[PDB]
Swiss-Prot record, chain B:
Post-translational modification as stated in the protein's UniProt record: N-acetylated by NAT1.
Lineage of source species: Eukaryota, Fungi, Dikarya, Ascomycota, Saccharomycotina
Protein name per UniProt: 26S proteasome regulatory subunit RPN2
Renumbered ranges of PC repeats: 1-33, 34-66
Organism superkingdom: Eukaryota
Curated annotation (Swiss-Prot), chain D:
Full protein stretch here: 198 to 262 of 523
Family per record: Belongs to the proteasome subunit S3 family.
Subunit organization: The 26S proteasome is composed of a core protease, known as the 20S proteasome, capped at one or both ends by the 19S regulatory complex (RC). The RC is composed of at least 18 different subunits in two subcomplexes, the base and the lid, which form the portions proximal and distal to the 20S proteolytic core, respectively.
UniProt function note: Acts as a regulatory subunit of the 26S proteasome which is involved in the ATP-dependent degradation of ubiquitinated proteins.
Naturally occurring in which organism (per UniProt): Saccharomyces cerevisiae (strain ATCC 204508 / S288c) (Baker's yeast)
Domain of life: Eukaryota
Other remarks on this protein: Present with 16700 molecules/cell in log phase SD medium.
The protein, known as: 26S proteasome regulatory subunit RPN3
Processing after translation: N-acetylated by NAT1.
Lineage, top ranks: Eukaryota, Fungi, Dikarya, Ascomycota, Saccharomycotina
Gene name of this polypeptide: RPN3
UniProtKB/Swiss-Prot annotation, chain E:
Further details from the record: Present with 9890 molecules/cell in log phase SD medium.
Organism: Saccharomyces cerevisiae (strain ATCC 204508 / S288c)
Family assignment from sequence similarity: Belongs to the proteasome subunit S14 family.
Role: Acts as a regulatory subunit of the 26S proteasome which is involved in the ATP-dependent degradation of ubiquitinated proteins. Necessary for activation of the CDC28 kinase.
Keyword Iron in record: no
One matching Pfam family: CSN8_PSD8_EIF3K
Protein name: 26S proteasome regulatory subunit RPN12
PCI domain mapped to chain residues: 70-245
Swiss-Prot record, chain H:
Lineage: Eukaryota, Fungi, Dikarya, Ascomycota, Saccharomycotina
Protein name per Swiss-Prot or TrEMBL: 26S proteasome regulatory subunit RPN8
PTM section of the record: N-acetylated by NAT1.
Function comment: Acts as a regulatory subunit of the 26S proteasome which is involved in the ATP-dependent degradation of ubiquitinated proteins.
Source superkingdom: Eukaryota
SS bond partners: none
Extra facts: Present with 19800 molecules/cell in log phase SD medium.
Family indicated by similarity: Belongs to the peptidase M67A family.
Amino acid sequence: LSNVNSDIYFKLKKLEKEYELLTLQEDYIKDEQ
Amino acid sequence: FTIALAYAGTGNNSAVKRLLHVAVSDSNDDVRRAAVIALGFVLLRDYTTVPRIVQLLSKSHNAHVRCGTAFALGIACA
Amino acid sequence: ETHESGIKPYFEQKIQETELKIRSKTENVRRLEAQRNAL
Amino acid sequence: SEEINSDNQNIILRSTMMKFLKIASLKHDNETKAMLINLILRDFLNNGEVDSASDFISKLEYPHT
Amino acid sequence: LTKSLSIAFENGDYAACEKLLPPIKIELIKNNLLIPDLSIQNDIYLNDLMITKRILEVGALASIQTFNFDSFENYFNQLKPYYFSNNHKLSESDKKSKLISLYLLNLLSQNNTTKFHSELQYLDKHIKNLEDDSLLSYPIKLDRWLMEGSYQKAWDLLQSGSQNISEFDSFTDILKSAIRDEIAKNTELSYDFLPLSNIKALLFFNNEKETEKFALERNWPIVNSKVYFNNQSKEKADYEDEMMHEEDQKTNIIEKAMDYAISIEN
Amino acid sequence: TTAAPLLALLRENQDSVKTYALESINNVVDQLWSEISNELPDIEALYDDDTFSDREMAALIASKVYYNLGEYESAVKYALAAKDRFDIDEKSQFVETIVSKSIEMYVQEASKQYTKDEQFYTKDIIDPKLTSIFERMIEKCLKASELKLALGIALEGYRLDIIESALKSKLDQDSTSENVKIINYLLTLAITTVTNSKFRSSILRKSFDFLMNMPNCDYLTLNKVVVNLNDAGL
Amino acid sequence: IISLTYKKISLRDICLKLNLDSEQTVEYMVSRAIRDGVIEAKINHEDGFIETTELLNIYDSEDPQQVFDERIKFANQLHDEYLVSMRYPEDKKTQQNEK
Amino acid sequence: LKDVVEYLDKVINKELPINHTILGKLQDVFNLLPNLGTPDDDEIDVENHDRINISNNLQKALTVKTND
């Protein structure tokens, strides 16, 4: 169960910056459309 | 290109919304070109999601927008 | 392992909400993409 | 068949659904939330308690997704 | 000790019953721990269930026969859920019918029919035909007639209810005023004006002086032996119209028009 | 069985009856909660009053009910009001709901007062309770012996104390490589994750000194800090 | 029903039809009813008849608008339900290889 | 509208020579002003009722298109 915990703090925080950017994209294509 | 150079490397969400907003809203054709090339700088080390964004911008009627689209991709994944 | 299972759900709560958001997010961006394309 | 043993074990049966529903809200399982709520509302009418049933419905976490 | 309380009851001096009650409340805590809360049921616990029961029942009934509100609710609040049903050996006793009838009558005297039905729902499974209706019929007929809206018939049952007064008068008196009030409310819709002789007959007053007394109290001036309900009514209406809630409740045709347009343009 | 006897007992005015009732309800609060939701404003009033001496327990009951219903926000405030019997919650399987909440709110609040003043520890804006939970959670991480858990949580909240102290205490060189590796993971995270100048700059500068003590250190790791912050004096 | 057929109807008539026990008893049942407003009537004691108040011309009043406002919202809620669901299979197919 | 309000203050405070033409126009505004409580207003409400209904029927027809 330790593994699960460790990736939560480690790798996944860096991928969450990315997912904020893709949410920005949703906003954007409401304006473009 | 002021925004591109200052805000380089780390994507910034502010910087990116600003660039796309300008490109949609501002009609002149050189200026529309300048924002696409400019985005490639801000997202130079995070070029993963970049084709998915510029996917839309290829289809643009404008000849100029398609040009800057070609280069931006160049720049990001150089 | 037993010690870690206790505290695991506390790590999880903030992350799972983030996950659930992602699911809604993904469906959203693509659907507007379809509208955007046809136009 | 009616028996008092059936009655003691009935109290056990209510308590277990209530403990589990909180776990299943956090996983936000549309399947799980649905099944448990149908069962609990039924149990309550059988025992006639108005008061508990109204509180239980106020939340409305019962999905339609 | 516990036996002192039992005989204090039968003497009918209940003032002294209360003076003894806080010691007995200390002992009623222990008594609760004797009962297992029906997790395990055996004939050891059954003995405890029976002795706790007798205390609950005589003590509940004392609170009903006392008659000053403040003390009456406070002593009563615990007693009411305890006494209505925890009944031993799965749940008979002749006391069961008598105690239910008095609880249900309380709710009709608080003038909550909503609760009268809610409480009734609970009972239903356990009294379907076990007791059927016995003394239980006394709150049941009464409800039926106010639901029909037979005010006449209702008054008749209460008046005849003076026969059976035993501790039931604790409700009977409340209920008189309640009928009279209800009618008063309805007939404001019907018409504005009643000659004096009609006000008494309709609202079920039995005393001429009380009619005219009650007239003065809802602020109706009688001048030259003629009632003039016109004054207060009109004044009351004006103060009501001014309150603050009001902008969003009332709305506006343009507000609706503006909501539709922007749905399209999403 | 039902809560109807239990309710009845609260009402009894006499002190000892109310106290006994609180214990009785407490047993079955986790088992059954939907029946005493109705009657929450009374349990709350008992907590207000300062006549009871199991007063801390009265608020515990309110809190417990509120998390089961799913109003998690109502739970955490009522819990943090009492400042008692939160020790048991952290160490339970079942209730990690209110533990996660206490940790989320705390990381947010701290960062907000961190930007205004680098010192915000001294202010009473941060409650001692809130503090105490936090270092207990550092306590769990280290028993399980996984330091990424401790470093990241603190990092989120602009907690300068916790970060500094962890890197210093690491210095023992049981293995040289192990020391390096954990520090190496912190720096990559710190450029990206932190955006406030004051916190960001301060932790990298500090990181250079810790690394430097070790003679067997990689000057690859040191090199990184020195380029980022771009300070010649380092 | 008796009130809708017979607008002004003496209390005497009603009892004869439905064998209600007395004029005093039926008055009270009717009185109770129109508090909760089902019958939409009024009793005139002094003149000995009960007179239905209905008159129509509620099109002129604001009430149809409240009704119709809701009906628009219901249609809109339909459209939204269509739109969201519709796209969820398409994702699957574009991602899947096709001939 | 506001400027017309301050113009009237300026006649009686700051002594502009009274331009009677303006006053003539404002009389025509009070006089040809719809009066409320008039049964004309009741008519207006009927017209409103019809168009708001027609909107409702058009809204439904669009539902049929979106549903296809």
